[PDB]
């Protein structure tokens, strides 16, 4: 049986069975993804350090991002206070290296840790180790567990918790460090570290006033929120609170944001409907690929107001199918592929086939390098 | 109390001098915020093209180099190469290359000094410009290749392109406004050589490699972009002729070409964003005829050799410039309906339509806006 953490445990666990195995398409499989991930075996571990502008608090190891939906504004000297324009990114975003690097850090060590799950071979485990260590734990270069400064936004005087989002990236990744544990790359000393990084980000999460705040917010932050904090809770084997965040948080959240029809009006209003819809349940795939290792399916549970979360994916099968329908503002291209996992996770969670068979005709592309596809070869032909 | 030839309108700049050397209070007000809005260049370190750690295939930091912003890596190959192309869908690796924002920040500020310094006559913004000017363009060290080979490159595509020529127009209107500088003290007869010896350089690439050939002869947005550009460079080397037989050799045959008789612009419906594509192709014809019209030469009224004129892209357009929600094409992001004042403004004028002067002037400019090419067009703000 998979270590408890943020994937899907059947299919990963069905990956090392059939290579162990040795069964061919699995081993090709395998082998496709391995020669992909060579790039992360020679890629130089990133650091949040790397970055000139420094954040209010003057130290490097503290993450800061820019909220990609603020920009100056014109009609002001200096451009301050930043003004909103929702949807549109602004190109300012990537002058602070992290939002790509944690990025980066993500995929590589997601990669690198599912392939020494599945293969066990020491070279996937000594380059996850690498990074893990580089970004997390290391007195210099790893991050303050905190995201104080996540999507700060320049003249604005009150402090905000929405940018807590940007953790999915390097949290996954935490996650994975589960995988490793049992190498010979990954020593006892490393996994405390770790384990006191993870203690610490934790409780900046739960007591910290951005904290608290994302904690409540009944929209799609707080339901990433909740799913970044399983990530957390399961890192640290704390089964019980991944119980009560279940029952008490994510599922009261995700039956506030339901309305009668399926819908979710929150983000119908965004000048992104369709994407933020899918975000939002993005949110509670992630979260059920850790509840449901622990007996707890997230897709099937009804709420206290009888919602339930396959109601939500009922209203959006349609537009799935048939992206032109989509009857709300959308002023940018939706990705079809983001339906095709989508609909596997709640299909195979609801036992509904139509969504497993729609999943399968979407697709993934069988050779594609985008590491959160590695364990979905039952989509890629 | 004429301007000197160059990429601007030059009727509302002669106006704007005039009126603030009479001490018009409306004017004087307006400038006094212009001059707000450009101390920040003049306090801002002059850029250069060779602030870059990736090198292009010359190994020459002096070589501008951008990617072309549609073609992203291909995740079904091991490498992402060679990269496949989303046409409207800007891929933000394009920002990996300094020059694409540091010429654009370059062109903003040598502009607005030299603009200013034309009106209000003081030395702290031909100071200023020069400046810019000297870093950017002339200078040993730090100064730009003439040349545009490495512009909007695409990893893994085997053949040159020339369709990153555009990235030229940032630059290039700073060319021009080079020539409001010529007579202070700051502007030496050193630098206007050594600029001027680049310009006729850079004019010599865009004539005769293979890149710009290609570029002069494309009958789309890109040969209309290239010869406004080519415009500009004349402009500043005083080549008033040329300028002639660019207009009626190149502009008003490829103009000509591209309005179908509906005037539409086909090669623009096409595109993914096509109402911003349709405005692009005229922002050319704006910023050509900005300077045409200097030497006489009216590009929204003079036909071409089959009789289509410009003007009839212009109606094409118009009832979209109202309701941009009536657009009936692929617009896969939202259109700036303030490009459209500067431009039915444009055209208004140059054509007589009081219609569109008076929907210019209805759409607006935001009067406190810091964008610098809103600079001459007070007549659309208030």
């Given at each position: 049986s998979a270590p408890l953490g943020p994937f899907n445990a059947t299919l990963l666990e069905q990956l090392k069975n059939d290579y162990q195995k040795g069964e061919k398409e699995v081993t090709r499989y395998i082998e496709l993804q391995e020669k992909v991930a060579e790039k992360y075996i020679k890629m130089t571990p990133l650091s949040v350090?790397?970055?000139?502008?420094?954040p209010p608090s003057k130290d490097p190891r503290d993450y800061m991002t820019l909220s990609p939906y603020w920009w100056p504004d014109s009609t002001k000297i200096d451009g301050l206070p930043y003004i909103r324009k929702d949807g549109e990114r602004n190109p300012?975003?990537?002058?602070?290296?992290?939002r790509e690097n944690a990025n980066r850090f993500g995929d590589a060590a997601y990669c690198l840790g599912v392939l020494y799950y599945i293969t066990g071979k020491e070279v996937y485990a000594k380059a996850c180790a690498n990074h893990l260590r580089t970004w997390?734990?290391?007195?210099?270069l790893g991050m303050n567990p905190?995201?104080?400064?996540?999507?700060a936004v320049p003249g604005m005087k009150k402090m905000r918790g929405?940018?807590?989002?940007?953790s999915r990236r390097f949290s996954r990744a935490l996650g994975v460090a589960k995988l490793i544990?049992?190498?010979?790359?990954?020593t006892p000393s490393d996994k405390k570290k770790l384990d006191d990084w993870a203690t610490a980000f934790c409780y900046w999460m739960e007591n910290s006033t951005q904290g608290q705040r994302e904690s409540h917010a009944a929209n799609n932050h707080g339901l990433w929120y909740e799913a970044i904090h399983l990530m957390v809770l399961a890192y640290l084997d704390r089964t019980d609170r991944i119980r009560e965040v279940a029952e008490q948080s994510i599922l009261p959240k995700m039956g506030a944001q339901i309305?009668?029809?399926?819908?979710l009006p929150q983000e119908l209003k965004r000048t992104l409907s369709l994407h933020y819809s899918t975000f939002a349940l993005e949110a509670l795939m992630e979260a059920n690929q850790i509840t449901s290792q622990i007996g707890?399916?997230?897709?099937?549970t009804p709420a206290s107001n009888g919602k339930v979360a396959s109601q939500a994916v009922d209203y959006l099968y349609p537009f799935y199918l048939n992206?032109?329908?989509?009857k709300f503002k959308q002023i940018k291209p939706f990705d079809q592929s983001r339906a095709a996992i989508l609909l596997y996770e709640a299909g195979t969670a609801l036992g509904n086939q139509k969504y497993v068979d729609t999943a399968k005709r979407i697709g993934l592309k069988?050779?594609?390098?985008?590491?959160?596809?590695?364990?979905?070869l039952v989509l890629k032909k």
């Open positions: 350090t790397a970055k000139k502008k420094l300012e975003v990537y002058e602070y290296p992290e997390f734990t290391d007195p210099k905190n995201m104080t400064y996540a999507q929405s940018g807590f989002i940007d544990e049992g190498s010979k790359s990954w309305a009668d029809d399926g819908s707890i399916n997230l897709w099937s992206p032109e329908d989509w069988y050779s594609t390098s985008d590491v959160e596809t590695i364990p979905y």
